[PDB]
């Protein structure tokens, strides 16, 4: 999930490069690098890493980059939620390892009781 959290910044760079391409090809197709209008342009002129600029369908490649960016920000939400759930699960499973690695007998009995209470559960 932290790999996807780095892919978030990679797709932000992809959105920058697509917005660079979008007016483009201001510049030549290749990478459409640093295409900006000298005047009467808002030169975002963001720094970009230049893959060769696709392609047969010149707007749908930049639009595909912009879609990858939307998926990336939804990933920024959901993978952080999944990391929180995974640390909660690891804390609970480390506790279960501790409680299995010996104790009581009666304690294990009421642990079973509490688990089955937690959750309703057809009735």
């Amino acid at each position: 999930l932290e790999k996807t959290l780095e892919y978030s910044e990679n797709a932000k760079e992809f959105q920058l490069y697509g917005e660079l391409l979008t007016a483009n090809l201001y510049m030549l197709k290749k990478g459409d690098k640093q295409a900006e209008v000298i005047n009467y342009y808002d030169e975002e002129s963001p720094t970009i890493t230049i893959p060769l600029n696709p392609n047969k369908t010149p707007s749908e490649n930049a639009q595909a980059y912009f879609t990858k960016y939307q998926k990336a920000k939804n990933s920024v939400a959901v993978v952080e939620e999944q990391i929180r759930l995974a640390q909660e699960e690891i804390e609970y499973f480390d506790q279960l390892i501790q409680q299995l690695s010996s104790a009581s007998p009666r304690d294990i009995s009421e642990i079973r009781e509490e688990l089955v209470e937690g959750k309703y559960l057809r009735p």
Partner: protein
């Protein structure tokens, strides 16, 4: 001519004023200082500015009044409106600052009388979700 609502405190970078002046054929950064000079005393609000175009690449900007929506946010205090106006009455604005807001819109609005203007901004206040009281 391309008209647009430019925020006063964020007119420096390549957003809104960038691509509008870029297709006109002028350097944005040489006019961002001129924007920030005349938008200093109304900073923090989004001000519509008319952008006239000339053949000799000379540009003179005619500023306008702040909108009735933004002025009602100043009079009320809340920045973002409600999800459903006239269903969640989030704020109430007294009539004296309503009269002041209507009186600020003299040189651009073609209303003959101030009573017509306060009847207009009563209607704009109803779109805000703000009780006119």
């Amino acid at each position: 001519v391309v008209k647009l609502q430019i925020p006063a405190g964020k007119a420096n970078p390549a957003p809104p004023v960038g691509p509008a002046l870029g297709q006109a054929g002028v350097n944005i950064m040489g006019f961002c200082k001129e924007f920030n000079a005349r938008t200093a005393d109304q900073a923090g609000l989004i001000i519509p500015v008319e952008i006239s175009v000339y053949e000799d690449r000379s540009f003179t900007f005619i500023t306008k009044t702040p909108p009735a929506a933004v002025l009602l946010k100043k009079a009320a205090g809340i920045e973002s409106g409600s999800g459903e106006p006239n269903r969640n009455k989030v704020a109430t604005v007294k009539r004296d600052k309503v009269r002041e807001i209507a009186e600020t819109k003299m040189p651009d609005l073609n209303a003959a009388d101030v009573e017509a203007a306060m009847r207009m901004v009563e209607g704009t206040a109803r779109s805000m979700g703000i009780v006119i009281e």
